[PDB]
Write an enzyme that holds these catalytic residues in place. Structure first.
Site, PDB file in Angstrom:
ATOM      1  NE  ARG A 195     -11.930  -5.082  -1.494  1.00 19.41           N
ATOM      2  CZ  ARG A 195     -10.920  -4.395  -1.109  1.00 19.41           C
ATOM      3  NH1 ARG A 195      -9.931  -3.915  -1.945  1.00 19.41           N
ATOM      4  NH2 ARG A 195     -10.950  -3.647  -0.001  1.00 19.41           N
TER       5      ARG A 195
ATOM      6  CG  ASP B  61      -2.151  -0.965   0.965  1.00 17.70           C
ATOM      7  OD1 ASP B  61      -2.656  -0.846   0.027  1.00 17.70           O
ATOM      8  OD2 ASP B  61      -2.398  -1.769   2.017  1.00 17.70           O
TER       9      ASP B  61
ATOM     10  CE1 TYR C 219     -10.559  -0.030  -1.285  1.00 16.45           C
ATOM     11  CE2 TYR C 219      -9.771   2.108  -1.622  1.00 16.45           C
ATOM     12  CZ  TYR C 219      -9.843   0.794  -0.892  1.00 16.45           C
ATOM     13  OH  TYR C 219      -9.103   0.718   0.155  1.00 16.45           O
TER      14      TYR C 219
ATOM     15  CD  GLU D  43     -10.147   3.069   2.087  1.00 19.84           C
ATOM     16  OE1 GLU D  43     -11.313   2.346   2.214  1.00 19.84           O
ATOM     17  OE2 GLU D  43      -9.152   3.015   1.761  1.00 19.84           O
TER      18      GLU D  43
ATOM     19  NE  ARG E  33     -12.206  -0.616   4.060  1.00 21.79           N
ATOM     20  CZ  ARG E  33     -11.307  -1.160   3.418  1.00 21.79           C
ATOM     21  NH1 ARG E  33     -10.806  -0.411   2.363  1.00 21.79           N
ATOM     22  NH2 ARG E  33     -10.600  -2.131   3.694  1.00 21.79           N
TER      23      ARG E  33
HETATM   24  C1  LIG Z   1      -8.791   0.457   6.069  1.00 19.15           C
HETATM   25  C2  LIG Z   1      -8.368   1.571   5.367  1.00 19.15           C
HETATM   26  C3  LIG Z   1      -6.807   1.659   5.223  1.00 19.15           C
HETATM   27  C4  LIG Z   1      -6.037   1.363   6.660  1.00 19.15           C
HETATM   28  C5  LIG Z   1      -4.722   1.786   6.635  1.00 19.15           C
HETATM   29  O1  LIG Z   1      -6.115   0.666   4.624  1.00 19.15           O
HETATM   30  C6  LIG Z   1      -6.403   0.864   3.089  1.00 19.15           C
HETATM   31  C7  LIG Z   1      -7.288  -0.441   2.512  1.00 19.15           C
HETATM   32  C8  LIG Z   1      -6.857  -0.796   1.322  1.00 19.15           C
HETATM   33  P1  LIG Z   1      -7.546  -2.246   0.839  1.00 19.15           P
HETATM   34  O2  LIG Z   1      -8.269  -2.286  -0.976  1.00 19.15           O
HETATM   35  O3  LIG Z   1      -8.697  -3.023   1.666  1.00 19.15           O
HETATM   36  O4  LIG Z   1      -6.370  -3.469   0.713  1.00 19.15           O
HETATM   37  C9  LIG Z   1      -6.496  -4.697   0.194  1.00 19.15           C
HETATM   38  C10 LIG Z   1      -5.995  -0.254   0.231  1.00 19.15           C
HETATM   39  C11 LIG Z   1      -5.569   1.186   0.766  1.00 19.15           C
HETATM   40  N1  LIG Z   1      -4.357   1.629  -0.116  1.00 19.15           N
HETATM   41  C12 LIG Z   1      -5.292   1.200   2.366  1.00 19.15           C
HETATM   42  N2  LIG Z   1      -4.841   2.613   2.695  1.00 19.15           N
HETATM   43  C13 LIG Z   1      -3.557   2.932   3.085  1.00 19.15           C
HETATM   44  C14 LIG Z   1      -3.285   4.355   3.564  1.00 19.15           C
HETATM   45  O5  LIG Z   1      -2.648   2.422   3.131  1.00 19.15           O
END
Ligand SMILES: CCC(CC)O[C@@H]1C=C(P(=O)(O)OC)C[C@H](N)[C@H]1NC(C)=O
Ligand SMILES: *[C@@H]1O[C@H](CO)[C@@H](O[C@@H]2O[C@H](CO)[C@@H](O[C@@H]3O[C@H](CO)[C@@H](O)[C@H](O[C@H]4O[C@H](CO)[C@@H](O)[C@H](O)[C@@H]4O)[C@@H]3O)[C@H](O)[C@H]2NC(C)=O)[C@H](O)[C@H]1NC(C)=O
Ligand SMILES: *[C@@H]1O[C@H](CO)[C@@H](O[C@@H]2O[C@H](CO)[C@@H](O[C@@H]3O[C@H](CO)[C@@H](O)[C@H](O[C@H]4O[C@H](CO)[C@@H](O)[C@H](O)[C@@H]4O)[C@@H]3O)[C@H](O)[C@H]2NC(C)=O)[C@H](O)[C@H]1NC(C)=O
Ligand SMILES: *[C@@H]1O[C@H](CO)[C@@H](O[C@@H]2O[C@H](CO)[C@@H](O[C@@H]3O[C@H](CO)[C@@H](O)[C@H](O)[C@@H]3O)[C@H](O)[C@H]2NC(C)=O)[C@H](O)[C@H]1NC(C)=O
Ligand SMILES: *[C@@H]1O[C@H](CO)[C@@H](O[C@@H]2O[C@H](CO)[C@@H](O[C@@H]3O[C@H](CO)[C@@H](O)[C@H](O)[C@@H]3O)[C@H](O)[C@H]2NC(C)=O)[C@H](O)[C@H]1NC(C)=O
Ligand SMILES: *[C@@H]1O[C@H](CO)[C@@H](O[C@@H]2O[C@H](CO)[C@@H](O)[C@H](O)[C@H]2NC(C)=O)[C@H](O)[C@H]1NC(C)=O
Ligand SMILES: *[C@@H]1O[C@H](CO)[C@@H](O[C@@H]2O[C@H](CO)[C@@H](O)[C@H](O)[C@H]2NC(C)=O)[C@H](O)[C@H]1NC(C)=O
Ligand SMILES: *[C@@H]1O[C@H](CO)[C@@H](O[C@@H]2O[C@H](CO)[C@@H](O)[C@H](O)[C@H]2NC(C)=O)[C@H](O)[C@H]1NC(C)=O
Ligand SMILES: *[C@@H]1O[C@H](CO)[C@@H](O[C@@H]2O[C@H](CO)[C@@H](O)[C@H](O)[C@H]2NC(C)=O)[C@H](O)[C@H]1NC(C)=O
Ligand SMILES: CCC(CC)O[C@@H]1C=C(P(=O)(O)OC)C[C@H](N)[C@H]1NC(C)=O
Ligand SMILES: CCC(CC)O[C@@H]1C=C(P(=O)(O)OC)C[C@H](N)[C@H]1NC(C)=O
Ligand SMILES: CCC(CC)O[C@@H]1C=C(P(=O)(O)OC)C[C@H](N)[C@H]1NC(C)=O
Ligand SMILES: *[C@@H]1O[C@H](CO)[C@@H](O)[C@H](O)[C@H]1NC(C)=O
Ligand SMILES: *[C@@H]1O[C@H](CO)[C@@H](O)[C@H](O)[C@H]1NC(C)=O
Ligand SMILES: *[C@@H]1O[C@H](CO)[C@@H](O)[C@H](O)[C@H]1NC(C)=O
Ligand SMILES: *[C@@H]1O[C@H](CO)[C@@H](O)[C@H](O)[C@H]1NC(C)=O
Ligand SMILES: [Ca+2]
Ligand SMILES: [Ca+2]
Ligand SMILES: [Ca+2]
Ligand SMILES: [Ca+2]
Ligand SMILES: [Ca+2]
Ligand SMILES: [Ca+2]
Ligand SMILES: [Ca+2]
Ligand SMILES: [Ca+2]
Lengths: 387, 387, 387, 387
Positions: free
Chosen positions: C287, C70, C321, C197, C212
Site C-alpha cells: 500500500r 478492526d 484505502y 467495500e 474489492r
Molecule cells: C475484506 C474486507 C473486510 C472483511 C471483514 O475486512 C476489512 C479489511 C481491512 P484491511 O485494511 O485490508 O486490513 C488490513 C480493514 C477493514 N476495517 C476490514 N473490515 C472490517 C469490517 O473489519
C-alpha cells in the site's frame, strides 16, 4: 431587532439565586484556558456573555509569568458564553485592551478597549466589531474605564472614564454613545471625589453608577444621570462600608470616609429609593469572601443597621472584583429590569506563591422567591506545575 | 446578498487605530496552535477573517522542525475569525497551498491556493469552497501570488501572479475573475521591473497594487488597472524607501532604486493623489519594527520629507510581512472604502535559535479621530520546549 | 430543501485538482486528534464532510494501543468538515460502528453504522440522526458495508452490504433506502465473484459500484443497477490491474484475475462508456503510492495500454484505502455530476513500529482545466512519543 | 415552534438498537474532558443532548482528586451533543448544580439545578437559560431530584424531588412546571415507600416514574400521575428484581422487597399494560453489567419468568446509573412516543485504585426491527497517569 427601551424600574429583590460558575483556574490546570483578570458579564436580547481581559497567555504556561502586571501590549478584550471557561477555542476576539467596557443596545454590541502608552492611551470603540470612534487620553495619565458593562437606554449607551492620579484628585467624564459614536460627553465637577471602575446600570430611563474611590474613601461614590448627561453625585451614606479595605462598620458619611480610604476594589450596589443592596468582601482588610447586604435606608442614612445578609463566598476564600449586570425585559419577558451581579475570584499574586495572577467567576440574579447563602469559591489548588 | 460596488474612493485617514492582535506564538507555547506564515486579513459584508498558510504542524511539536522551508505538500490555506489564534479547533479549511490569495465579492469567498512542484505548480480557484478554475505555471518556475487579499469591484475580483526568477526579470500577469472563473488575463509588459507579493485594493472602481521588487529595487513597484485590465506601472518615488532591506532615506527614484535592492519583504502602501501612506520596517537591514508614514507628495516626488510618523512595533522587536485590507461601505455603512493593514510578527528561524519559524499578527484600521503610536510586538519568549 | 435529482451524466474530466488535505497524524502528535481508519467524504447541497471510524482513542495516548484491530465496541462513526483534523472538539457523532456508509439525499443525512458481534452484527440506519431502520446479519459472518458514500437519486439512496467469508464465496445484497427505511433489497446472483467495500456513485439515474475482490481477483469487480435494483455484474477488463496486491500490468480479463488475487484494498474507478479512470496504488505488492490512469477502452478491453497517468502519492510513501465521492449539480451549479476521490494515508501497524494504526487523508476533484501530478503524502515522523 | 403534545402512547418495542457511545474516559486520558457523573440524555424537537454534572475539573488532572464526593460548590450542570465527549470546548453551561433534571417542552429548555448547603439547598429553575423560579429545601436534608429528564405534556413539564433521609422514610413531591414556573406541587402520601432519582416519561398524556428505594426495597418503586398531579403509587411486582444490590431472582412483591433492599442504583423501566421492560445490572451485588428484560406480566405479577433478555454490558464490566429518555413524534414523525435509554459506565472510586471517579455513556432506542445483544463497555485502562 429592536433597541432596548430601558424605561422600566429595577425589579425589587429579596435575595440572589446562583446563575453561573466557570471553574476557570481549576480547569486551566490541564486545559487551554486564558490567564485573565477584570472579567464581567453583559447580555443581549438573546444571550449573556462573559467579557475578560486576557494576558495573551494560557494558564500553566511560561508566558503566564509576570501577569501581576496590569497594562501591556499583549492584553486583549475577548468574550465567551457565560459559565464557560475562557479558552482560545471558544472565545470571540473583541479588541486590543488593558481596560474595557461593553454593552448591547438591542441591535449590536458596543465594545470599548483602551490600549497604548500610559501617557497617551486611546479608547477604541467598536459597534458590531467595526471601529466607530476613538477617544484619546485628556490628562495623559492612564485613560481607563469601567471593567464592567456600559448601560443602554433607547438606543443610547453610557459609560464613565477616568484620567489622572489613582491616589489623588483626577478627572472623570460621562459619555453618551449611539451606534458606537460618541455624541455627547461632560466632565464631572467633582472636587474631592474619586471615581474608578464604575458599575453602571439603567433604571427608569436614567443611569446609576457605583464606583471605587481609590484616593480617600472606604465608602463608594456614585454618579447618576439622565440621557442628556445632567448628573448628580454623592457617596453611599451607610455605615455598612462597601469598599475594601475599609474600617469595621460604624456610623457612616454621605461624603468620602477617610478611614482606610486609600486603595480599594471594584464593586457595585443597587439603589432602591433610600435603600441599597451592597455587595462587598467579608474581610475589612483583604480581598476575601463576599456577601450581599440589604440596608433599607443605606443610600441616604448613616447608621450601620441592616436587614438581610446573604453569604456568597466564605471569609477564608479569595474574592476580588465585582460588578453589576442587568437583564432587560426584552430578554426575560418581565416588566422590570432584573439586577444581577458577578464576582471575580482572583488567584495567584500578590497573595499566593505563583508566577502568575488569574481569576475565575461566579454570578447571581436577583429574585423574590427562596434563596440561600453558601460559599462558592474558586477551588483551585495552588501552586501549579509551572510555579 | 449583493455584490460589493467598489466604486467609492478610499477614505482619507489621519492615523491608525488598533484593530486586532492574536498572540498566536505566546498561546501556542501550550495551546494547539498551527505553525503558520504568510497570514493575511480579508472581510465579507458580515465578518473579517485571518487567512494563513499552515505548515501542517503545531507549535512546540516535533513536526514544526524545518519550517523555514517555504513550499511543501503539507502546507494548507486555512482561515479563522480575526484576532483568534489559528487552531485546528477553530480554523476553516480552504485549500492545499504554499502560496495564496482570497477575497469576498459580496456573495461568496474566492480562494486561490497554489500547490504542486516548483516546475509546474497549479493555482486552484474555489468559489464558496467548490473548485471553479485552475491555472498552471506558464514559466515553470514557482507560480506564486499575493499572500494577501485580492480586490473586488462590481462582481469581478482581481489578482496578480508571478512566474520566473526571484532574482532577475520574471513574468507578471493580472487576472479578472468572476464567480471563481478566470474571464480575462493580461501579461504586464514590464522590462526591468520586478513584482512579487502584491498588496492590492480597490479605490473608485480601479485597482492599485503595491508590491515587492526582489531583484533590484529598495523602493516598491506598483501596478494599477481598471476592470478591463488596462494597466499603468511605476515605482513609488519617495526617498522614504519602503522595502526591507533598503538604504537610509535620501533622494528617491521613480524607477527601481538599486542600492540594497536585492531581496525584500512583502509590504503595502496607500495612494492618495500624489501622496502615500507607507508602512515599513524601522530597521533598514532586518525585519525589525514597524511604522506608518504619511508623505503628502511621496507617490510622485523624490524627496525624503514626510509629515506624519506613527509607531507600530518598536525597532528592537521582530516584524515581518505586511499587507493592505479594506472594509467596504457594505460592511461599515460609510461612504468610502476604509483602508486597514496587518503586520506579521515572524518568530524563529532564521534570526532565532529554534527548529521552527511561525508568526503572530496585529492589525489596524485607518480613522480621522485621535490615535497613538506604540509597540505591539509578538511577545513570545524563545526558544521553546521543543527547541 | 429539495431532493438531489441525480439524472445528469458524470462530468467528463481530463485530470484531478487537489481539493483537501487534513495532516491528521502530523497534528495529532500534539493535538487531540482521533485514531481513525476507513475515512470517506460525502457532500450535501451545502457542504462536504469527512466521515471516519474512530477507535475511541486519541493519537499519542495509551488507548491507541492495539488499534490494528478492526472491530470493537469502542469504534464510532463520526464526521467533521472536509480538510479539518478529526478531533473531539470539531466532530459530530453519527453512530456506533465498525463498518459504515453515509450519503445525503438533498434533504437529510442517511448514516449506516454496523456494530455488534461477528456472528450477528446489526446495521443501524439513521435519517437526520434518528434511528429509522435496522438490518441484521443474514449469514452470521461479519455483516459489512462500503466504507464510502452511498449514492442517491431522486429521493432514494443505494448501498451494498456483504456477509460471509472474506477469503471465499460470500453473499452480496443491494439496498434501496428512502428517508432511512429499507424499501427494497435484492441478493446479487454472483457465483465466483467477490464484492467488498464498494465505491458507488450515481450517473444518469443509475448506480455504478466498483469494489474489492478479496478472494481471487486482482482486477476490480463492479455492479451497476437502476432504481428498481435491476443489476448487471462484471470485472474491469483492463490489463491496468486496479487492486493491491496485483501482478505487473499485462493482458487482463473481464472475469477475476487469479494472479495475486487474494486480499486487496478498497478502491474505486469511474466508467465513461468503454473507458475508465482507475485510481490505484503505485506499488503492485504494498500500500504505497497513488496514481490516476485514464484508459479509454479499459472498462471492456483487456490490453494494458493507457493514455494519461497523473501522480498523486509517491511510490516510497504510504497510501491505503481510496474511494469515490461526487458533487451534484445542486451543490456546484454545473450541468453534470462532478467526480471526486479521496485517499487514506495509513500510518503505523503493520508496516511501522508503533503500538497504533491511524490515517490521514487527501482528496481531489475532476476538472477539464490544467492540472499537475505530484506527491502529497501523510508526512508524519514515526514512531511517536507513546511508542 | 410548537409545544410537544405528549398524548400518543409509548411505542411498543421488541428490542434495543444502539444509539450513542461517547468513550469519554478513554479520550480524557489525553484530551480535555470533564470529570462527570450523573449523566443523562434529553431531546428537543430538533436534537438530543447529553446533560451531566461536572466536578469542575478535567480527567488526568490533580483537581480530579476526591471526586468520589457527591456535593460541592464546584459542580455544574452542562450539556453537549449526544455521543460527543463532555469538554470545555463543546459543552454548554446550564446551571450550578450537584443534583439536576432538564427537559424541552417543544419551545425551550427547562433546567433544574440544585446547589447550596445540605441543610438548605435551593433548586434554581431556568427556561431558555433565564432564572424563572426557585424552590428551597422543605426538610433541610439534601433537597435532590431525578438525575434524568423531566417529562412534558402539552406545555407543562413534570418532575419529582426528595428531601429527607436516604436510609429511612423521607418526603417526596411532584411538581408541575410551565415556562419554568412551578404552578402546582403535591406531597406524595407514601408511608413505608422510598423514592430517589426518578426516571419519568410521558405516555398517553400521563407521567410514569420508576425510581430507586434506597431504604428497604430491592424492587423499584413507581409513581404515576396526570396533569392535575392526581397520583398512584406502587412497586414493580416482578421477581426479576430491578435494583442493585438485590437478591437472586425469586418470587417478588408488589410492596418493597426487604432482602438486600438498603442502598440502590438509579434505574428505569417501561410499563406496557401489565408488562414491563426492565433495565438492570447483571451482578446482584455490584454495579457490573447491564441487560434489558421483557417480562410480559411483570408490572403486576410476582413470578420470575420472562420472555426476552438482551445483553448490553457484560457481567465483568463496570456499569452504573441508567435512565429513560423519549423521542416524541414531533422529533421522529412517528405516531407514538419512542422509548430510549442510557447507561452510565462509572470508572474509578470506590471500586478501582484511582484518585477520581468519572463516567462515560452508552444509549439505545427501542425498535421493532432486528437487534442484537452485545457488550459495549467503557474500555478505559485504569489507573491513569495522575493516579
Ligand atoms: C475484506 C474486507 C473486510 C472483511 C471483514 O475486512 C476489512 C479489511 C481491512 P484491511 O485494511 O485490508 O486490513 C488490513 C480493514 C477493514 N476495517 C476490514 N473490515 C472490517 C469490517 O473489519
Ligand atoms: C529537528 O531536526 C534536526 C535536524 O535533523 C534534528 O537534529 C539532528 O538530530 C540528529 C539525531 O540526534 C543528529 O544526527 C546525528 O548526528 C550525529 C553527529 O552529531 C551522528 O553521529 C548520528 O549518526 C549516528 O547515529 C545514527 C542512529 O543510530 C546512525 O544511523 C548513524 O550511522 C550513526 O551511527 C546522527 O546522524 C544531527 O546531528 C542533529 N542535527 C543538528 C542538531 O543540527 C533535531 O533533533 C530535530 N528536533 C526535533 C525535536 O525533531
Ligand atoms: C490526592 O489527594 C491525596 C490525599 O490528600 C494525596 O495523597 C496524600 O498526599 C500527601 C502529600 O504527599 C500525604 O500527606 C503526607 O503524609 C505523610 C505520611 O505518609 C506525612 O508525614 C506528611 O506530613 C509531613 O509533611 C508535611 C509537608 O512538609 C508537613 O506539613 C507535616 O507536618 C509533616 O512533616 C503529609 O501529611 C498523604 O499521606 C497522602 N495520602 C494518601 C496517598 O493516601 C495525593 O497526593 C493527591 N494526588 C494528587 C495528584 O493530587
Ligand atoms: C427614543 O429615541 C428615538 C430616536 O430614534 C426618539 O424619537 C425621536 O424623537 C425626536 C425628538 O422629538 C424627533 O425629532 C424630530 O425631528 C423631526 C424631523 O426629523 C422634527 O420635525 C421634530 O420637530 C423633532 O425635532 C424624532 O423625529 C424621533 N424619531 C423617531 C424615529 O421616532 C424617541 O422619542 C425616544 N423615546 C423616548 C421614550 O425617549
Ligand atoms: C421521483 O420520485 C417521485 C416520488 O416523490 C416520483 O413521483 C411519483 O411517481 C409515481 C409513479 O408514477 C406516482 O404514483 C402515482 O400515484 C397516484 C396516487 O397517489 C396514482 O393515481 C398513479 O396512478 C401513480 O401510481 C406519484 O404520484 C408521483 N408523486 C409525486 C409527488 O410526483 C417521480 O416520478 C420521480 N421522478 C423520476 C424522474 O423518476
Ligand atoms: C416604555 O417604552 C415602551 C416602548 O417604547 C413604551 O411602549 C410603547 O408606547 C407607545 C406609546 O404609548 C405605544 O405606541 C407603543 O405601542 C408601545 N410599545 C409597546 C411595545 O408596548 C412604554 O409606554 C414605556 N413605558 C413606560 C413609560 O412605563
Ligand atoms: C456606486 O454604485 C452604486 C450602486 O450600484 C450606485 O448607486 C445606484 O445607481 C443608481 C443611481 O445613480 C440607481 O439606479 C441605484 O438605485 C443606485 N443604488 C443604490 C444602492 O444607491 C452609485 O451611483 C455609484 N456611486 C458613484 C459615486 O458613482
Ligand atoms: C432531470 O431532473 C430534473 C428535475 O426534476 C428535470 O427538470 C424538470 O423537468 C420537468 C419536466 O420537464 C419540469 O416541469 C421541471 O420544471 C424541471 N425542473 C427543473 C428544475 O428544471 C429534468 O427534465 C431532468 N433532466 C434530464 C432527463 O435530462
Ligand atoms: C393529540 O393532540 C393532537 C394535537 O393537538 C390532536 O390533534 C388536534 O386535534 C384536533 C383534531 O381532533 C384538531 O383541531 C387539530 O388540528 C389537531 N392537530 C393536529 C396537528 O393534528 C389529537 O387529536 C390528539 N391525539 C389523540 C390520539 O387524541
Ligand atoms: C485604581 C484603578 C486603576 C488605576 C490605574 O488600577 C486598577 C487596579 C487594579 P487592582 O486589582 O486594585 O490591582 C491589584 C487592577 C486594574 N487592572 C487596574 N487598572 C489598570 C487600567 O491598570
Ligand atoms: C520573493 C518572493 C518568493 C519567491 C519564490 O519567495 C517568498 C519569500 C519569502 P521570505 O519571507 O522573503 O523568506 C525568508 C517567504 C515566501 N513564502 C516565499 N514564497 C514562496 C512561494 O516560496
Ligand atoms: C440515594 C440518593 C442520594 C441521596 C443523597 O445519593 C446519591 C447517590 C449516589 P451513588 O452513586 O449511590 O453513590 C456511590 C450518587 C448521587 N450523586 C447521590 N446524590 C446526591 C444528591 O448526593
Ligand atoms: C519569570 O520571569 C523572570 C523575569 O524575566 C525570569 O528571570 C524567571 O526565570 C521567570 N520564571 C519562571 C519560573 O518562568
Ligand atoms: C456591474 O455589473 C453588471 C453585470 O452584472 C453590469 O450590468 C453593470 O453595468 C455593472 N456596473 C458598473 C457600474 O460598472
Ligand atoms: C499495549 O498492550 C499490551 C497488551 O495489553 C500491553 O501488555 C502493553 O504493555 C501495551 N504497551 C504500551 C506501550 O502501552
Ligand atoms: C393544552 O393546553 C392549552 C393551554 O395553552 C389548552 O387550551 C388545551 O385545552 C390543552 N389541550 C389538551 C389536549 O389538554
Ligand atoms: Ca477606597
Ligand atoms: Ca441602615
Ligand atoms: Ca528589494
Ligand atoms: Ca515627501
Ligand atoms: Ca484482490
Ligand atoms: Ca487500454
Ligand atoms: Ca434498594
Ligand atoms: Ca413474569
Amino acid at each position: 431587532s429592536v433597541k432596548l427601551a430601558g424605561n422600566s424600574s429595577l425589579c425589587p429583590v429579596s435575595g440572589w439565586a446562583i446563575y453561573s460558575k466557570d471553574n476557570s483556574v481549576r480547569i486551566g490546570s490541564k486545559g487551554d484556558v486564558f490567564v485573565i483578570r477584570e472579567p464581567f458579564i453583559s447580555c443581549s436580547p438573546l444571550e449573556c456573555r462573559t467579557f475578560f481581559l486576557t494576558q495573551g497567555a494560557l494558564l500553566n504556561d511560561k508566558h503566564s509569568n509576570g501577569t501581576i502586571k496590569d497594562r501591556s501590549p499583549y492584553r486583549t478584550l475577548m468574550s465567551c458564553p457565560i459559565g464557560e471557561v475562557p479558552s482560545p477555542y471558544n472565545s470571540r476576539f473583541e479588541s486590543v485592551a488593558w481596560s474595557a467596557s461593553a454593552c448591547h443596545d438591542g441591535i449590536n454590541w458596543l465594545t470599548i478597549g483602551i490600549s497604548g502608552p500610559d501617557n497617551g492611551a486611546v479608547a477604541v470603540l467598536k459597534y458590531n466589531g467595526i471601529i466607530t470612534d476613538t477617544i484619546k487620553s485628556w490628562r495623559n495619565n492612564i485613560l481607563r474605564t469601567q471593567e464592567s458593562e456600559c448601560a443602554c437606554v433607547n438606543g443610547s449607551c453610557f459609560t464613565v472614564m477616568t484620567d489622572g492620579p489613582s491616589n489623588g484628585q483626577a478627572s472623570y467624564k460621562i459619555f453618551r454613545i449611539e451606534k458606537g459614536k460618541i455624541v455627547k460627553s461632560v466632565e464631572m465637577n467633582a472636587p474631592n471625589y474619586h471615581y474608578e471602575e464604575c458599575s453602571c446600570y439603567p433604571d427608569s430611563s436614567e443611569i446609576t453608577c457605583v464606583c471605587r474611590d481609590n484616593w480617600h474613601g472606604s465608602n463608594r461614590p456614585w454618579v447618576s444621570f439622565n440621557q442628556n448627561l445632567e448628573y448628580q453625585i454623592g457617596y453611599i451614606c451607610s455605615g455598612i462600608f462597601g469598599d475594601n479595605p475599609r474600617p469595621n462598620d460604624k456610623t457612616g458619611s454621605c461624603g468620602p470616609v477617610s478611614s482606610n480610604g486609600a486603595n480599594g476594589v471594584k464593586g457595585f450596589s443597587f439603589k432602591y429609593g433610600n435603600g441599597v443592596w451592597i455587595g462587598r468582601t467579608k474581610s475589612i482588610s483583604s480581598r476575601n469572601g463576599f456577601e450581599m447586604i440589604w440596608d433599607p435606608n443605606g443610600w441616604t442614612g448613616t447608621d450601620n443597621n441592616f436587614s438581610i445578609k446573604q453569604d456568597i463566598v466564605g471569609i477564608n476564600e479569595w474574592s476580588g472584583y465585582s460588578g453589576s449586570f442587568v437583564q432587560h425585559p426584552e430578554l426575560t419577558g418581565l416588566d422590570c429590569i432584573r439586577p444581577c451581579f458577578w464576582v471575580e475570584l482572583i488567584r495567584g499574586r500578590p497573595k499566593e506563591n505563583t508566577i502568575w495572577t488569574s481569576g475565575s467567576s461566579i454570578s447571581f440574579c436577583g429574585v423574590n422567591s427562596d434563596t440561600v447563602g453558601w460559599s462558592w469559591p474558586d477551588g483551585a489548588e495552588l501552586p501549579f506545575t509551572i510555579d
